[PDB]
Design a protein around this ligand. Structure first.
Ligand code: NAD
Ligand code: NAD
Ligand code: NAD
Ligand code: NAD
Ligand code: AKG
Ligand code: AKG
Ligand code: AKG
Ligand code: AKG
Ligand code: CL
Ligand code: CL
Ligand code: CL
Ligand code: CL
Lengths: 310, 310, 309, 310
């Protein structure tokens, strides 16, 4: 029975973690969130300890550890800028970390975490559910059979209501900006499929749209990211869809929205089986996303312009 | 299409109000919550406006009024002490109010609300789902047949985890205390069935237990309230059950937990149909609960002592 | 005895408002702040009500109004995005408003307040302390005696520590951005002295520097604003100074640091006498600051580039 | 040059700590507060780091420690329940702690901190400025010359406006209650003069008044504590005084309000000189204050009743 603590319990994504912990036969020992709108927790783990103050949470988990009943994992569902320091808290307390994406905001934070693993005997893992999406695992096998770099069009639209622009998600110091907070999913998919980015361009940047181009070891990629649902293709909009997440490559197209929200238990299962996504796996997309925070806009060549900018 | 604005969107009970507004064919025009952990809202009303600052939400709703697009109803799912001033906001904005229980904390607030309903021509309503619970409607009908007052044992145990003690729920200025925040359900049930309280006693009053006695026009009632699930009767507790909500009238048992969390849409419907629970309906249980904040403890006679007290 | 309520009581700036209210013979009936380090209030108005919830503060003031004991002014010292909706509250409660700068963030908000003033017969005022100052007030009479366009270089560097970057003051939706949160003082001084901005350019807009160029009816202005103290001129910086606040008009300087934390009381007095700074006085700087946060960057000509760039 | 970090920078007492660090020739390296009303700091330590997130503050200080540049002291001016876990943070960072009163809330926390001191070779100190108040030091000397149990009337009135009741200071879980948050000063003065409390009674306990009776090894003590300035004696009220802090014993009375707010630098100097008030010194008043939280009210005998209750 794997022992978990959880940060960010009051949040949107937290119930998916509570479900994962239940489904892998784990127990939630304690949670942290400065907000107390967490009453849903009793329907999953009615005996879990709860803290509003991170310093009190830390002291409690240390007391559990300084006596043999420590947690095995800290699940981290706090705002992005808190992932790094809460992962360090976990490792120091003798727990593995399982952090939401992006694992951290900066490449310097990845480098420091690699050193800290070696001094604490624990490991840092991250939630990248696209890496367990059955359609994308199948695409990955297909693409591996083919020599040469591929040409890819990546379109990632996921609608967000008006609350998003009043939240931490649009504070770049907290979220990393749109290309990190939302785009890390696809920058990570592209690194997993096609390796390291040799060249990066950004062609459009507004509060709701970013678009650009990547030259990766295995592919040339035109990409478009939005949180404005008007960019969902019209035939799908008609049927009420608010998302469109598509990779077109090698003469095929895979739209990977189905089950996007139903893969957190599989990520937990892979992680507890020792097949999790660690620092080495997460680092490349974080490097790309971080470069994009400060990269100047450029004018795309026609070959490099995503079609939604045409 | 009834037009609603909602306060308390990030909270535990908010999704039941989103489901109710949906199911009655209403539209959520705008919501208010100082917390922004509200991403669930896009799965219901992906175009609703959102505010963290009450002053800005008010100015926005005042602008809508002034241009003939005012909201019809403010639904209120904020902490209890904010119900009164949020209902004052609804009324001044030219909207009706539908507030979670307890409707307000104090009888003086009920009295001032009556004045403001007269000044504004608007109405104040509240969510008391026990009044639409089919077993309790059935009970009320059977009691109408009967002559004389009844002897009643009311036992109300609903377990709460460790987060509750770190929330506004235990700040008596915010919540009104245990007998208000949780007990209002049953004080209101008893007022609805049995009328006004002629005499009130409190026999036990700790952070997790209140017990006492009421003499009502239609009943003598021994009551016990707890948020410690250890008080669930042993034959249910041994199975892991954490709630027990029972009214026993002249020795006949009605346990009413089933469907307790599945009646908000029916309250909303009754309200919109002119059958809502207004100030006059809610006032008596508020008067009882408010008395209980300062009523001195007394030693029960054996005939007035709830069985759980020994 | 003029009755006041105050918003933003916990904030850096509220003590000058407590002094003005005291000094002008007013009484503070109630205050609002989400935060609770407001104890200083006890040494001025030891009986004032206090609220952390805006809706409870509004209901309390509305009760007072309805029984004929309403406040006469709402003084507003909250973060900038709250000024507009708190002035709206003041007018709905039948009070005048006296707001910190910037009075509101957007010209559309000014227009709405003008409608609402007419509806309620109450007035919106703002604290423009540079306008009652001795050394800036000196200019306006002189300058005004001469004709011809002036050539102005405006430089303001006011160092801010690491806390600033973690506060609402860098959230553009809350503060209006650097030029507004720092700038607005001086854009208002410039509009006061030299009229409407007929051309506006922004040359730099980074998190610690905003710089640009204005042409006003009465002057051209090269301006530079920063909260990075490394831009304090070296003869001051070498001494450890972290601020520098200069307007040079046709080669003639005035530096501005001295009477800066100073003149809230006179502004209260003028306002109470019917000589306050209203929407019409405030609007132009608000229009310019709204452009300064929204216009695209452009590359300056040599002639139009502030020397510090 | 003694290196400090500070918690609670945006609050009421912090400016006194900034002044103290400056006056003892220290440097403030970094500060933590979730609130950002802190601009004052620039007039003292213009280059200090600042954090809103405790986990980021702790990671920053951990980095300093690891590269041989750790702070020497953590000064703690956060809410009272945070003192214990922030002192734990200091000790694990290899810093001494200098915490505002009360040092911690509970005797069990004192006991844990004694164990952690021994582990780390760092020390915990606290601000008890009455122990450096010249009038009280002079009184202590005068009393010493005697022998036999003293008879004491302690009256401690310190006015607070309406903001206090909407702050953390009235949340007993955060502040310890009135007898702890305000009262610790005088319980500590009494323990310093007269030793262990062998008998404790509480006679009144309202939001603005606590009163009771103690018998200590060296004195019997009738005490009264209020934040209602109406209890300042009329003659002092008539001249506008809002405090009255009086100890009457041995045929004299010492009123110790003068300079009560001007002794923080002296506490810092004593602490840096190795003459600070440690766990052993602070423990007894913490034990007494904690007992008073749960002690039921009793009816006083006339002899044991503070005069202000008569
Ligand atoms: N597909 C996915 O894998 C997916 C989807 C959504 C969000 N996320 C990620 O999950 C995280 C949570 O996002 P969300 O949408 O639930 O955001 P949210 O704003 O709904 O919830 C964030 C929670 O963090 C809490 N918080 C703030 N500071 C904290 C601290 N010091 N400790 C603990 N909790 C703290 C907030 O009070 C809040 O309840 C982010 O890292 C986000 O990128 C991932
Ligand atoms: N069976 C029932 O009918 C039932 C069950 C649970 C709760 N309730 C009631 O619903 C209300 C909410 O309880 P909850 O359990 O959801 O609590 P909660 O603590 O989960 O959520 C409360 C929400 O109110 C928000 N809030 C705080 N101040 C606000 C303001 N000024 N405006 C708008 N929002 C504000 C908080 O940020 C939070 O998201 C309470 O009145 C409670 O009694 C009813
Ligand atoms: N020289 C000047 O005249 C001068 C100097 C500084 C600031 N200001 C202005 O004064 C105002 C205060 O800035 P500050 O420096 O005190 O920042 P601040 O962050 O120190 O003060 C913040 C106070 O406002 C509060 N607040 C947030 N929401 C509120 C609400 N809905 N109602 C009332 N209060 C609320 C916050 O809790 C905070 O405690 C701003 O408009 C700023 O532009 C003017
Ligand atoms: N005479 C004295 O020695 C004296 C006088 C006043 C207060 N105090 C003590 O000083 C402490 C502060 O009291 P105050 O009056 O300044 O209260 P306050 O409410 O004015 O200030 C409290 C500060 O703590 C901050 N805070 C909350 N959580 C924090 C955290 N995790 N880390 C750091 N900061 C955090 C708050 O945001 C706030 O700015 C308390 O322990 C109090 O008992 C002592
Ligand atoms: O909806 C998406 O594609 C992104 C989900 C996510 O990771 C987020 O919202 O943070
Ligand atoms: O569970 C219950 O019976 C009470 C639900 C409720 O109203 C509450 O938690 O506020
Ligand atoms: O320091 C300055 O010059 C600007 C003051 C100001 O208005 C602010 O800080 O918001
Ligand atoms: O004023 C006093 O005597 C006590 C000071 C205070 O508030 C405190 O110590 O928290
Ligand atoms: Cl906690
Ligand atoms: Cl808002
Ligand atoms: Cl309030
Ligand atoms: Cl931080």
């Amino acid at each position: 029975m794997t022992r978990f603590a959880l940060t960010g319990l009051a949040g949107y994504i937290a119930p998916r973690h509570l479900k994962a912990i239940k489904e892998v036969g784990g127990v939630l020992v304690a949670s942290l969130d400065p907000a107390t709108n967490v009453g849903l927790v009793d329907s999953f783990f009615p005996e879990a300890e709860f803290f509003t103050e991170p310093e009190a949470f830390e002291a409690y988990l240390e007391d559990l550890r300084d006596r043999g009943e420590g947690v095995d994992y800290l699940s981290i569902a706090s705002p992005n800028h808190l992932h790094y320091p809460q992962i360090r808290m976990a490792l120091r307390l003798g727990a593995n970390a399982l952090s939401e994406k992006p694992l951290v905001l900066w490449p310097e934070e990845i480098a420091r975490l690699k050193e800290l693993e070696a001094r604490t005997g624990r490991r840092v893992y991250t939630v990248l559910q696209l890496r367990v999406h059955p359609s994308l695992l199948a695409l990955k096998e297909r693409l591996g059979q083919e020599k040469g770099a591929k040409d890819v069009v990546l379109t990632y639209v996921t609608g967000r209501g008006k609350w998003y622009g009043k939240s931490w998600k649009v504070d770049e110091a907290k979220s990393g900006g749109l290309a990190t907070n939302i785009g890390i999913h696809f920058f990570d998919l592209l690194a997993w499929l096609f390796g390291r980015a040799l060249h990066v361009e950004v062609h459009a940047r507004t509060p709701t749209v970013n678009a650009g181009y990547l030259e990766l070891e295995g592919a040339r990629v035109r990409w478009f990211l939005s949180i404005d649902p008007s960019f969902v293709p019209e035939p799908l909009r008609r049927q009420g869809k608010r998302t469109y997440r598509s990779i077109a490559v090698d003469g095929e197209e895979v739209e990977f929205s189905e089950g996007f929200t139903d893969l957190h238990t599989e990520v937990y299962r892979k992680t507890l089986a020792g097949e999790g996504f660690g620092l080495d796996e997460a680092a490349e997309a974080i490097r790309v996303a971080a470069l994009l925070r400060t990269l100047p806009l450029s004018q795309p060549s026609p070959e490099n312009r995503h079609p939604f900018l045409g």
